[PDB]
């Protein structure tokens, strides 16, 4: 009978006064509400609230003890059988556009192919964040969705139109072009601002400071984190509450945070011995202090990299590749 207990409570009401809201907290009723016990039932708590003269802060204390129990909504990881059924349906036969949106974020990429280091992906993810900072939306999440769609079209071409087979080959052949002609070696334009290696190499903390620097509010920070035969990306984009700090790894996929503190906690624990110890798994060397350092950290120039053309003769730019379609 929690429904009848919540109606009598709601009718007994002040819920917007700063005197009430200050009392609306946990472990506070046991110190200002005479006749309160943390083993009481919702029914007993409502009886104590109605039968009794209370102050503004005192009504807020009981309000929290009542609402924290009556309006409680608990969350928990979804059971594996629901995820297994969704992946089985979404990965079967013809590619499902809407299903791929929900499936892409749960997958990881593997190796032959092109690079095997994810050379072109870390770069395209950085261009995508340059474009997202400038207003576009979900450019990086759609890059993974399109790659998954292109691969599916290339594996079962008999299930797609000639237009779709042409789009899939063009997108995948474009990733191979970025690897064949690495923009880092181009001499007509400099796609990088700085190339921190050797005695200038950065640690995970160095990358975190560069990404979370509060002086970059509104401007994008685009870094390519290079480890032996394994390339990753880190970035910052947006402004104010919309500013986001992210990290990309072919294994973990794309991870973003609104909090600079959570981003720093994630990256430190990702590479640190305290948790995943990825720094030693990707075989990072150490500086004279014994701190893990990246073989190279490239501070990219989003604008120059976005305008780079991987295939000579063709006018398709990096930004152009992120807009290449797969389906009509």
Scan residues 84-113 and list those touching a copy of itself (CB under 8 A): 85-90, 92-94, 96-99, 102, 105-113
State which residue, 41 or 94, has the beta carbon closest to Cl ion: 94
The angle subtended at Cα 314 by Cα 113 and Cα 305, nearest 5°, is 70
Q: How far apart are CA 49 and CA 69, in angstroms?
A: 14
Asked if 193 is part of the footprint of a copy of itself (rule: CB under 8 A), the reply reads no
Asked if 323 is part of the footprint of a copy of itself (rule: CB under 8 A), the reply reads no
3-state secondary structure at position 248: strand
**Contacts for 297 with CB less than 8 Å, ≥ 6 apart:** 195, 196, 197, 201, 202, 206, 207, 210, 223, 224, 225, 226
Query: How many angstroms from the chain centroid is the CA of residue 166?
Result: 31
Site for Cl ion in 117-176 (CB under 5 A): 161-162
* Closest by CA position to 221, among listed 238, 201, 205: 238
Task: Please report how close the Cβ of residue 129 comes to a copy of itself at its closest, in angstroms.
Answer: 13
In the set 219, 262, 273, 283, which binds a copy of itself (CB under 8 A)? 262
In the set 34, 185, 313, 315, which binds a copy of itself (CB under 8 A)? 313
From the list a copy of itself, Cl ion, none, which binds 198 (C-beta under 5 to 8 Å, kind-based)? none
* Closest by CA position to 296, among listed 244, 224, 190: 224
- Count interface residues toward Cl ion (CB under 5 A): 17
Site for Cl ion in 44-83 (CB under 5 A): 55-56
Task: Please report how close the Cβ of residue 200 comes to a copy of itself at its closest, in angstroms.
Answer: 29
Which H/E stretch holds residue 116?
none
Tell me the CA distances in angstroms from 99 to 137, 145, 233, one per residue in order.
19, 10, 26
- Convert 292-312 to b/e letters by CB count within 10 Å (16 or more is b): bbbbbbbebbbebbbebbbee
State which residue, 22 or 200, has the beta carbon closest to a copy of itself: 22
Half-sphere exposure of 211 toward its Cβ, with a 13 Å CA cutoff? Answer: 35
Asked if 173 is part of the footprint of a copy of itself (rule: CB under 8 A), the reply reads yes
Task: Please report how close the Cβ of residue 194 comes to a copy of itself at its closest, in angstroms.
Answer: 27
Asked if 253 is part of the footprint of Cl ion (rule: CB under 5 A), the reply reads yes
Asked if 192 is part of the footprint of Cl ion (rule: CB under 5 A), the reply reads no
Q: How far apart are CA 271 and CA 179, in angstroms?
A: 26
Task: Please report how close the Cβ of residue 172 comes to Cl ion at its closest, in angstroms.
Answer: 14
Asked if 75 is part of the footprint of a copy of itself (rule: CB under 8 A), the reply reads yes
3-state secondary structure at position 256: strand
Site for a copy of itself in 113-172 (CB under 8 A): 113-114, 147-148, 150-151, 154-158, 162, 165-166, 169-170, 172
Asked if 184 is part of the footprint of Cl ion (rule: CB under 5 A), the reply reads yes
Asked if 326 is part of the footprint of Cl ion (rule: CB under 5 A), the reply reads yes
For the record, the structure tokens of 107 come out as 């997958």
Asked if 50 is part of the footprint of a copy of itself (rule: CB under 8 A), the reply reads no
């Amino acid at each position: 009978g929690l429904e009848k207990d919540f109606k009598r409570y709601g009718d007994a009401l002040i819920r917007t006064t700063k005197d009430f809201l200050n009392g609306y907290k946990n472990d506070h009723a046991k110190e200002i509400v005479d006749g309160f016990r943390s083993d009481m039932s919702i029914k007993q708590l409502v009886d104590l609230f109605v039968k009794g003269n209370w102050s503004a802060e005192q009504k807020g204390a009981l309000a929290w003890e009542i609402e924290s129990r009556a309006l409680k909504v608990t969350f928990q990881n979804k059971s594996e059988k629901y995820n297994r059924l969704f992946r089985e349906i979404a990965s079967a036969g013809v590619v499902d556009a809407k299903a791929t949106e929900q499936l892409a974020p749960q997958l990881m990429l593997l190796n032959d192919g092109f690079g095997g280091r994810a050379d072109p992906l870390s770069k395209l993810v950085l261009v995508a964040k340059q474009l997202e900072n400038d207003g576009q939306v979900g450019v990086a999440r759609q890059l993974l969705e399109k790659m998954y769609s292109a691969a599916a079209v290339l594996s079962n071409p008999t299930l797609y139109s000639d237009s779709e087979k042409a789009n899939a080959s063009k997108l995948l052949s474009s990733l191979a072009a970025i690897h064949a002609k690495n923009p880092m070696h181009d001499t007509s334009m400099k796609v990088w601002q700085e190339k921190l290696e050797g005695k200038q190499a950065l640690t995970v903390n160095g990358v975190v400071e560069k990404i979370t620097d509060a002086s970059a509010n509104g401007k994008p920070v685009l870094l390519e984190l290079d480890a032996p035969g394994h390339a990753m990306a880190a970035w910052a984009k947006g402004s104010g509450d919309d500013r986001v700090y992210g990290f990309y790894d072919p294994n973990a996929g794309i991870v973003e945070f609104s909090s600079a503190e959570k981003f720093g906690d994630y990256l430190t624990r990702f590479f640190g011995k305290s948790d995943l110890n990825m720094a030693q798994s990707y075989k990072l060397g150490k500086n004279d202090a014994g701190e893990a350092i990246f073989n190279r950290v490239v501070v990219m120039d989003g604008n120059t990299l976005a305008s780079y053309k991987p295939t000579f003769g063709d006018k398709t730019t990096m930004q152009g590749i992120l807009d290449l379609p797969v389906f009509d």
